[PDB]
Amino acid sequence: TALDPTELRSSLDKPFGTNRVIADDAMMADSITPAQYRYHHGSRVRPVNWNNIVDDKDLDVWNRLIANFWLPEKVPLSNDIPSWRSLTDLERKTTTRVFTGLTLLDTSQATIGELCQIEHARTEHEQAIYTNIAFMQSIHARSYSSIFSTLCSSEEIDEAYRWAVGNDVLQQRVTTVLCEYESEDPLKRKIAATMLSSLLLYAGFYLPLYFASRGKMMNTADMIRLILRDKAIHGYYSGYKFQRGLELRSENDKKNLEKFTMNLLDTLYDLEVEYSGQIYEGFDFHDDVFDFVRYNANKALMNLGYPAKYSEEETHVSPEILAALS
Amino acid sequence: ALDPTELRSSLDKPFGTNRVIADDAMMADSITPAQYRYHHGSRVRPVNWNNIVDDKDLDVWNRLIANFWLPEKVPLSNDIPSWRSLTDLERKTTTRVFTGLTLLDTSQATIGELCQIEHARTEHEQAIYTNIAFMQSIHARSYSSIFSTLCSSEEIDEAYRWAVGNDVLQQRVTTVLCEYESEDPLKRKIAATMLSSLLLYAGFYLPLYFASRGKMMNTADMIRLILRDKAIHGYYSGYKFQRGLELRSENDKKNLEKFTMNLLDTLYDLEVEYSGQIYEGFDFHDDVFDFVRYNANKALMNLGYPAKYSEEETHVSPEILAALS
Numbered sequence: 226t227a228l229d230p231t232e233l234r235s236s237l238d239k240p241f242g243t244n245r246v247i248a249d250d251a252m253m254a255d256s257i258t259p260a261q262y263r264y265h266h267g268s269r270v271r272p273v274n275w276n277n278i279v280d281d282k283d284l285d286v287w288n289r290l291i292a293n294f295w296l297p298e299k300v301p302l303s304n305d306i307p308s309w310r311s312l313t314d315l316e317r318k319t320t321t322r323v324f325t326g327l328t329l330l331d332t333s334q335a336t337i338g339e340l341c342q343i344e345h346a347r348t349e350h351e352q353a354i355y356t357n358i359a360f361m362q363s364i365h366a367r368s369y370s371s372i373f374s375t376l377c378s379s380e381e382i383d384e385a386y387r388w389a390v391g392n393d394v395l396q397q398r399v400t401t402v403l404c405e406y407e408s409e410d411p412l413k414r415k416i417a418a419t420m421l422s423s424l425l426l427y428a429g430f431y432l433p434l435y436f437a438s439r440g441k442m443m444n445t446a447d448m449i450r451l452i453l454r455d456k457a458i459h460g461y462y463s464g465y466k467f468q469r470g471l472e473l474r475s476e477n478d479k480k481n482l483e484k485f486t487m488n489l490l491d492t493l494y495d496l497e498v499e500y501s502g503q504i505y506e507g508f509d510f511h512d513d514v515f516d517f518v519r520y521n522a523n524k525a526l527m528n529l530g531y532p533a534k535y536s537e538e539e540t541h542v543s544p545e546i547l548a549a550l551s
Numbered sequence: 552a553l554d555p556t557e558l559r560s561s562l563d564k565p566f567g568t569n570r571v572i573a574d575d576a577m578m579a580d581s582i583t584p585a586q587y588r589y590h591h592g593s594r595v596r597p598v599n600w601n602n603i604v605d606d607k608d609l610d611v612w613n614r615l616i617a618n619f620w621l622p623e624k625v626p627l628s629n630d631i632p633s634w635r636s637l638t639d640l641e642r643k644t645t646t647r648v649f650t651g652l653t654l655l656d657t658s659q660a661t662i663g664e665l666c667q668i669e670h671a672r673t674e675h676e677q678a679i680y681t682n683i684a685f686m687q688s689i690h691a692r693s694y695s696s697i698f699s700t701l702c703s704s705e706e707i708d709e710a711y712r713w714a715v716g717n718d719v720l721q722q723r724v725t726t727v728l729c730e731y732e733s734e735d736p737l738k739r740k741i742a743a744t745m746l747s748s749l750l751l752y753a754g755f756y757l758p759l760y761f762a763s764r765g766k767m768m769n770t771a772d773m774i775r776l777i778l779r780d781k782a783i784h785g786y787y788s789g790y791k792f793q794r795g796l797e798l799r800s801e802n803d804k805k806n807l808e809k810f811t812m813n814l815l816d817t818l819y820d821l822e823v824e825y826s827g828q829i830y831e832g833f834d835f836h837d838d839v840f841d842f843v844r845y846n847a848n849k850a851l852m853n854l855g856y857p858a859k860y861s862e863e864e865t866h867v868s869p870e871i872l873a874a875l876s
Contacts, residue, residue, distance in 0.1 A: 273657045400563070
């Protein structure tokens with residue numbers, strides 16, 4: 226912009242005075258969170274108050290997510306080295322590639338996807354929760370790299386990252402979600418975040434669950450379950466907050482958002498078939514993977530308050546996989 | 552133009568269904584997810600912690616993660632007798648000071664640190680800002696943990712109303728918030744370094760003063776956990792500022808230094824107005840601003856600029872310096 230580069234950007238705004246008052250109820254009601262200031266210059270900004278909880282769910286979720294803090298350095302991943310070497314070359318290659326594509330999704334959520342939920346959050350405590358969630362998504366992304374450092378050669382890691390950048394369908398998947406985070410409708414942002422946490426990684430999580438059901442990669446499975454323990458809350462909470470915003474919307478917007486949700490799901494589902502169907506086509510468990518995808522698609526919808534899309538017939542995950550989930 | 556039920560990505564050309572092992576040019580043109588909004592159609596790259604670009608990033612990530620803490624592990628309730636031994640003025644001033652600090656850390660956690668991600672120099676630095684913002688939410692939360700342990704509902708209510716109703720506090724926070732909107736990423740970094748290395752220290756003076764007097768000893772421990780974080784936060788902001796600065800033109804370097812001194816001078820005068828009024832009934836008034844100017848020099852040093860204040864102007868009392876450690 227044309228402001229002299231040595232000037233403060235606040236010089237464009239009328240300064241606050243020199244008064245000091247105990248804000249009355251109207252002044253407090255008009256105050257805003259810091260993240261809302263960008264489009265409300267001149268409004269008064271209010272610090273977070275953890276002794277004034279607006280939605281008790283926020284305090285419960287904060288406390289649960291923080292109690293569940295973990296680091297990949299505490300999982301003995303090197304005890305999986307013999308199991309990893311007992312796999313085939315195709316199994317190893319498929320695992321590093323699948324995990325690199327999961328890294329891409331968690332990298333995106335950590336550095337923009339979850340963070341863009343803050344500005345239009347319903348409560349200030351929810352804003353703080355998103356900072357914890359985004360950090361833990363950086364932990365998730367970092368943790369796949371911890372697996373690679375323990376198990377893979379430099380050449381294997383390098384080729385998997387080149388595979389991910391060069392996979393057109395992977396790129397379509399991630400950028401489909403990234404574009405919705407640019408919407409000015411915060412509920413479109415919430416729907417995408419819910420899809421990311423409750424659906425988009427699960428065709429990938431199927432693979433380490435499969436190995437664990439066959440007695441392989443057991444310590445890696447523990448770490449995957451730590452990731453899953455976070456993401457189940459992340460997707461529940463995103464969908465919960467979507468519904469808190471939805472119930473204040475007009476009937477017009479409610480219909481738009483319902484149709485938008487089904488369009489996004491359909492598109493992301495088709496892309497999963499193309500993406501993971503190609504990755505898994507040389508494996509017996511190919512069809513079970515998409516039972517598992519549709520099963521988690523139903524949870525994503527349920528987290529948003531919408532009815533299930535797929536029938537029991539279409540979501541029958543083998544008992545061995547479900548047992549590996551715990 | 553898009554119907555509201557349609558996907559925003561439908562406005563862009565789709566990627567195909569090709570799958571290739573990216574060559575060097577394709578990898579070099581790939582970008583981080585936070586840059587995608589400025590480069591639709593570009594390929595997005597997952598973070599690779601086995602391909603560190605700046606070794607300093609890995610050291611800072613590991614140090615900050617190892618320093619994780621929660622206010623619930625500090626026995627703040629052992630300060631209740633000490634708190635009750637204070638005067639009315641001391642208790643009121645503490646809740647107001649800490650509510651003002653809450654406002655700055657709330658701002659950094661929820662926008663201030665996060666707006667550094669999109670123009671970060673490395674993907675690992677982007678991950679670090681997510682840790683730093685979370686810990687800044689911890690800092691802000693911890694002041695409320697103090698209030699929950701020590702204060703009445705009425706005290707808490709009045710302190711938050713005081714903060715919203717304090718014009719000078721509002722000017723201080725909004726001055727910083729406006730720079731986070733700057734189109735120049737290095738201005739965002741200068742502001743972040745000021746916040747972590749300067750803006751809270753007139754406030755941190757008070758618990759350090761109490762500890763130097765033998766009071767509020769467990770609260771002081773928590774404050775030192777906060778300081779242990781902010782020292783790295785401000786060092787890291789300033790380090791990354793300097794890495795970005797060495798790629799800028801000579802005229803931009805000159806303007807950025809002038810802007811820095813303009814920001815600092817504006818924030819200093821506001822501190823005198825804000826904390827001078829808060830500490831008016833206390834005799835340690837002069838020592839507070841020796842401590843402010845002392846930390847201002849560190850903020851400038853973190854940015855790679857010379858000290859502004861003389862040895863005479865930064866002569867912190869040795870009781871306060873001892874309470875830092």
